[PDB]
Write a protein that binds this ligand. Sequence first.
Ligand SMILES: *[B]([O])([O])[C]([C][C]([C])[C])[N]C(=O)[C]([C]C1=[C][C]=[C][C]=[C]1)[N]C(=O)C1=[C]N=[C][C]=N1
Ligand SMILES: *[B]([O])([O])[C]([C][C]([C])[C])[N]C(=O)[C]([C]C1=[C][C]=[C][C]=[C]1)[N]C(=O)C1=[C]N=[C][C]=N1
Lengths: 49, 426, 182, 98, 49
Amino acid sequence: APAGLEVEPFPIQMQVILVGTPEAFEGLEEDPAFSELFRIRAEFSPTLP
Amino acid sequence: VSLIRPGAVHRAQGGYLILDALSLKREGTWEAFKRALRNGQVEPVTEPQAPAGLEVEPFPIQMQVILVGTPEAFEGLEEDPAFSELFRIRAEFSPTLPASPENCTALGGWLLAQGFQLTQGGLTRLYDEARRMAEQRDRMDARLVEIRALAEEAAVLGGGLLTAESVEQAIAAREHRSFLSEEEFLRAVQEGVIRLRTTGRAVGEVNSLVVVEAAPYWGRPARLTARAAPGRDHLISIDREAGLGGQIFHKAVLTLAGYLRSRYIEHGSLPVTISLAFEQNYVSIEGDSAGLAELVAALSAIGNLPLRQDLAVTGAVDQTGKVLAVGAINAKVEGFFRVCKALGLSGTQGVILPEANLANLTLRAEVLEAVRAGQFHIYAVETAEQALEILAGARMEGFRGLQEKIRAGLEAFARLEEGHDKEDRE
Amino acid sequence: GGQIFHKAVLTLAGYLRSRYIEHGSLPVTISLAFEQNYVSIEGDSAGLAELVAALSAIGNLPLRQDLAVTGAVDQTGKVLAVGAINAKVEGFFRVCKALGLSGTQGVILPEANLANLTLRAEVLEAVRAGQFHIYAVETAEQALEILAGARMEGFRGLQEKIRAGLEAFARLEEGHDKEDRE
Amino acid sequence: MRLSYEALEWRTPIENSTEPVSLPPPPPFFGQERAREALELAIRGGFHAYLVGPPSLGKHEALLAYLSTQSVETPPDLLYVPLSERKVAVLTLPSGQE
Amino acid sequence: MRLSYEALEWRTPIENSTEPVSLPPPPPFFGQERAREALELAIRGGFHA
Ligand SMILES: *[B]([O])([O])[C]([C][C]([C])[C])[N]C(=O)[C]([C]C1=[C][C]=[C][C]=[C]1)[N]C(=O)C1=[C]N=[C][C]=N1
Ligand SMILES: *[B]([O])([O])[C]([C][C]([C])[C])[N]C(=O)[C]([C]C1=[C][C]=[C][C]=[C]1)[N]C(=O)C1=[C]N=[C][C]=N1
């Protein structure tokens, strides 16, 4: 790109909801910023009664 | 000259430039940054396709850069002598602040500054939770954003007011949101898949306490079995021989092996071989927190001493027979209480923990209520002698003593090897 | 053999060491091999099978080959739960049916796995007809009693024969020593 | 020996769970007087400092607030001057002269 | 001891293999009340889950 628009930082109003397997997150839980950004852990039980 | 865009360094002139150690050692701009610092070489970067580039004359740097990062973020950057010569001032944040009423008042003022609404009870509960995070009764956790996140959770659970009940609700919800693993473990224990005994007395079996990894650490008992057989001294760690035990686990095993070797001397080398295994382990073991449990289990196996299965035993031990402090004692005690409650509290189940961890015992409300009601006990010891006295329900010194029984068991094992040698020679 | 397989082997070795004490160290050496294996082994599912096979070898106990044995064991001699019990039972039933059901073939599985026994229709029909059995045990003592078809305790029991076999092995070793010294 | 409940009760007693507290904002780096002193020395001496602490502790927010509390002489208006069609240098001038 | 067939029969008995069932749709995250509660908390509080 010969030039680029200087986009001003924008406040985030969305609520991101990550989805993944426990293995897909244990490789992402090692980042403290992940644990500080994503506080709510919604675990699906593998087996229902 | 009209197409150069100022960077962070250019607008940091006369002031301060805050940077993160991760964003430097990760994006590879650390070398360029330290050359811009030492030599004043700030070069507006250009794409390689550029047909030409302005020759930017080196600029003396007037800003004061203040790197921010974790100790791990800087130990990977301290190896450069240019860093140690450029950044002389080290501003270390203590992980834990002292637990003082002034500190609690400061925390409350900080929370009120954020926009929260604290009641006195809510502030008290938040301060107690901060003390619990630090795992110290006299220190409170300094991670203010963790407390702020808990405050936000309690605020949305209490409508906007941080009541003590609201904070307790937030704590319980946070515990329950990560309770699936412990719930499954409890179900497995109830079904008999993971056989644990929270009642009765079994020889050589001890409910060791184990803390799992992953999101908030849950303690859970792990049955430990020690079996004593005649043979030349070989205290076998089955979890280490199989390769599951870590370095510190092997260190603990060797430490208690040396204690056993040097404690019983009225024969030659230790005339028994002891096999130590975590039943239903199937996972790598790391750390030295089951040293006391291993030692008491081995002693019971040697002396044929039935150990009260209702008491879980934690704590490291040195090779002179003294219980050593361990980490995450709250998780261990609460996990054993959880398992005991799931099986139904017998009114005598308890946890044997090092005397040195009393300052770390910040137990939850339910565990404390159980202790007050007498439905759950917490024993504190400093030597393994006391721990085995509690488990076996007897005294080492004195006739029909635990020490006498262990000596008799070692004597019997030695005489059995002796009879085998007698048959070999005759 | 993997890490957990070695853990199981060591566990049952310790159980054998501590179970039989009327000599010095265990006077026998036991060789355990999966025949036609040729593949890496992982897991602790055959601890009970290994233990009963070792006990039979020690005591010269003929084990009923019609019964397949699964289940882990701890070093106090108690059968522990195992995974994929349905697959194990159905596979043994498949092999028995391929060779023709004898009316006595069965599977010895941990008592702790009863909540996991969700067998297929054909296996359940075979059990109902008596053409296939499912034994549940919690200690290896029961599994050996079932396999050898005798009662552990008692006169002419399995325990007496295992003790006699260990005594014979120690007798032969000390006879070798007697020759060495004279 | 068995620990009594009082020997185990660690929670600070609650006077009342009502009457919203009114407390003044604490000073930046409260309870972190070591880091505050180090950073004060860095600001006074014009050195380069680095903030070390366990992750998620508020180092960035506390440091930004404290630096906002600080004050300094008005920074000169720096700018780029073309020494030639090829050569440019950063020229610093007193504020307003730009 | 040998397990009887009744002690091994796990299948739920069938009332009839006909008469197509008519059942109302279950609530989302049925049997996953933990995840439902966590996600409700995230929606109410505007967090990232
Ligand atoms: B311990 O707390 O020292 C314990 C020792 C072991 C011999 C029973 N280990 C653990 O709890 C560790 C985590 C740990 C936390 C704090 C300090 C040191 C170690 N975890 C495990 O051993 C484990 C085992 N199985 C599954 C999960 N975690
Ligand atoms: B087991 O069920 O613990 C068993 C142990 C082995 C000594 C008979 N392991 C296995 O059967 C494993 C798969 C497995 C499933 C569930 C839990 C643990 C392990 N497979 C093998 O050992 C194997 C060997 N040869 C070929 C194929 N698979």
